[PDB]
Amino acid sequence: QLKTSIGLITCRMNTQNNQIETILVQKRYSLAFSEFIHCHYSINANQGHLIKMFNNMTINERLLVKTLDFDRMWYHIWIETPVYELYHKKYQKFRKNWLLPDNGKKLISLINQAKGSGTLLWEIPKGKPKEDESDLTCAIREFEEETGITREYYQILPEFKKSMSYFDGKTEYKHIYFLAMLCKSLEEPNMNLSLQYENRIAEISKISWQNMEAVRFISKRQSFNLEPMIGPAFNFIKNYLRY
Amino acid sequence: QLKTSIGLITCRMNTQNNQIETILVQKRYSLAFSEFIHCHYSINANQGHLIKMFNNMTINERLLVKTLDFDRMWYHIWIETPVYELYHKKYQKFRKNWLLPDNGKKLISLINQAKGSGTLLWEIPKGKPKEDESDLTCAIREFEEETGITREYYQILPEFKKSMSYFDGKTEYKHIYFLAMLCKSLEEPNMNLSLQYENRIAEISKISWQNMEAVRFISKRQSFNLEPMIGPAFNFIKNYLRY
């Protein structure tokens, strides 16, 4: 099939240096954890995944799994949003895998034997377009759903549009990116994260300005490499700022 | 008074580059969170702290506080180690601050109004010496309590010893550091973190080799600056490796 996400690259010049920075966001939890409490694994096939899943969670996440209070695990991703059917499907699939048969003991054992720890991803804010939206409207909406940064702080630069496509697993994920330049100054965007706006924090743990060296530094340390999108983003910024 | 911690700086040469790296560890939770469930704050004095404490927690931590299940907050730091008296002291101090008076509503409100998010520290493994120990014995013991890295992997370099002293708050914290060079190769130290060794994970979320640029990068982004200890550590390594 074709999974397609659309995001926005928002940049500024932090006047202290002659350096272009962009907004990246960090995820609160790992994919591995999310795959676990949504049961994206089988207990009859693919052992090697079951082992990788547990290893690629953070230590805190594993500690949550060691609890066996699936509700506590659910809260970590959902934070009390009401999905009962979703909940109870996953809960019963959870109950039949390690509570009925072995009473946790295989799960708990697998948790203990799990070695190392995962890494929470830095990403360009991106999302899935609503049915009646233009690409750019999705990008705008998703960008400030995720950062509180409203329209009056940036100007869309219309003639930029980059598109990565992935199939490392497999199907095809198309990632499309517009570009924005900041105008009203905004020195501390990580300050828009607050538990009262439960959708900025549903998935984000940090918002932050990142120059290029930060972009490269983070990319050496996570599977998702994001120089191919910030590289051209910043180049386009430079050529724009000249004129 | 004189608070004194003693740690060990363990280095290697990752042959791929001509680059010296050292072991740093990351904390699982923030000081702000730990100050909160141990009641290192007053509700009658120092409002400005109460606000900073909440802001300097991670989003997950705040979500734990938004639970009001103090036991769930306790588990985050203690992971079921038996301290009942400690627990019940802190629980009752917790109960009388926001459960009795306002039934959470001021605490929950303060949580919601909390803006931004904290950062979990990267540190050189360090600890507090037992009563009958030499400095170096504390450093050795604490180093592999915290990383699983036993004695046969490194050689102590005896003629290095660095000592920082802090009083930004205030009292005096003396931080003393020995130096070790790796010998048996150890390509992936983050693999020693596992919930079966509950004391390596009690406080650590990642172990990792860091070259100098990583050291500087992390230091621009956390209050604890650690170039003054790795700087001389690496210099001493270089001069050692020559001869």
Residue numbers in the entry:
A (entry chain A), B (entry chain A): 6 to 248
Quote the study that presented this structure, word for word:
As the only nucleoside diphosphate-linked moiety X (Nudix) decapping enzyme encoded in the ASFV genome, g5Rp works in both the degradation of cellular mRNA and the hydrolyzation of the diphosphoinositol polyphosphates. Each protomer is composed of a unique N-terminal helical domain and a C-terminal classic Nudix domain. The two g5Rp protomers interact head to head to form a dimer, and the dimeric interface is formed by extensive polar and nonpolar interactions. As g5Rp is an mRNA-decapping enzyme, we identified key residues, including K8, K94, K95, K98, K175, R221, and K243 located on the substrate RNA binding interfaces of g5Rp which are important to RNA binding and decapping enzyme activity.
To investigate structural insights into the catalytic mechanism of g5Rp, we determined its dimeric structure by single-wavelength anomalous diffraction (SAD) phases using selenomethionine (SeMet)-labeled protein. The g5Rp dimer is composed of two protomers that each adopt a “boxing glove” shape with a distinct helical domain and Nudix domain. The helical domain (residues 36 to 124) forms a globin-fold-like feature composed of six α-helices (α1 to α6) that connects to the Nudix domain by two hinge linkers (linker I, residues 32 to 35; linker II, residues 119 to 139). The Nudix domain (residues 1 to 35 and 125 to 250) consists of a central curved β-sheet (β1, β2, β3, β4) surrounded by five α-helices (α7 to α11) and several loops, thereby forming a classic α-β-α sandwich structure. The Nudix motif located in the center of the Nudix domain is highly conserved and comprises the loop-helix-loop architecture that contains the Nudix signature sequence extending from residues 132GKPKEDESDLTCAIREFEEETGI154 in g5Rp. Therefore, a search on the Dali server was carried out for the helical domain alone, whereupon no homologous structure with a Z-score above 4 was found, suggesting that the helical domain of g5Rp adopts a novel fold. The results suggested that g5Rp forms a stable symmetric dimer in crystal packing. The dimer was composed of two protomers (A and B) positioned in an orientation similar to two boxing gloves stuck together back to back. One interface was composed of four α-helices (α3 and α4 from each A and B protomer) from the N terminus of each protomer. The other dimer interface was located at the linker II portion of the C terminus and one solvent contact surface of the Nudix domain.
